Design a protein around this ligand. Sequence first.
Ligand SMILES: *Cc1c(COP(=O)(O)O)cnc(C)c1O
Length: 226
Amino acid sequence: DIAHNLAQVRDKISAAATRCGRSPEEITLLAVSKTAPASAIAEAIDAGQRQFGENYVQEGVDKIRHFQELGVTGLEWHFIGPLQSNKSRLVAEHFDWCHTIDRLRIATRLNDQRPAELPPLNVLIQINISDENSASGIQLAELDELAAAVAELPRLRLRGLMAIPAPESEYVRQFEVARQMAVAFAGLKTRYPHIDTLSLGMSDDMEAAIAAGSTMVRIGTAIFGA
Ligand SMILES: *Cc1c(COP(=O)(O)O)cnc(C)c1O
């Protein structure tokens, strides 16, 4: 049951934050609903969840339109999958956040495709921190350059960083990789305005990411099931 899973996940988040001396309010739960049907999202919505993460543009847009047709207010939709140039218009027209900025041309497209009547699209820059098998995300060495370029796009708002670390079994490495992101995040916060979002941690590494300094865990299966 989705309402039960939501409350439980939220308890683990709340425990994990206070144990490491953090207010639980600091951590946002992003309910990842890729491969969940709109009916499962509706259950989470009714239980109070407002923030949802989608990986595949067209399915995400279908879910967004479904709930617009119902009139549901206060939802916040995060695109967290890799963004292809031929589908960037759909993200710019329908989503509130995009976590996967890893090249300037895609961010310029998003900027130029964002309808004028909408507020700026909130974006995160994606770091490939530890995954030699992913083509998504930049190296940390490229961050200062890309962040400066993206920060000038007036139809976007740079909010921080996202990473999908390579999967790790040892809690030690989970923490250590998450800390590299946390360190990059704090360094970025010392010069850029409104840097407040570090999208870091999934179901299996949630405690390490929070201890490392994540502000936003992306939880799918522990909420919606397989
Ligand atoms: C699917 C996915 C998640 C959620 O994964 P779970 O293991 O089900 O918690 C989080 N972030 C991204 C980028 C994903 O693609």
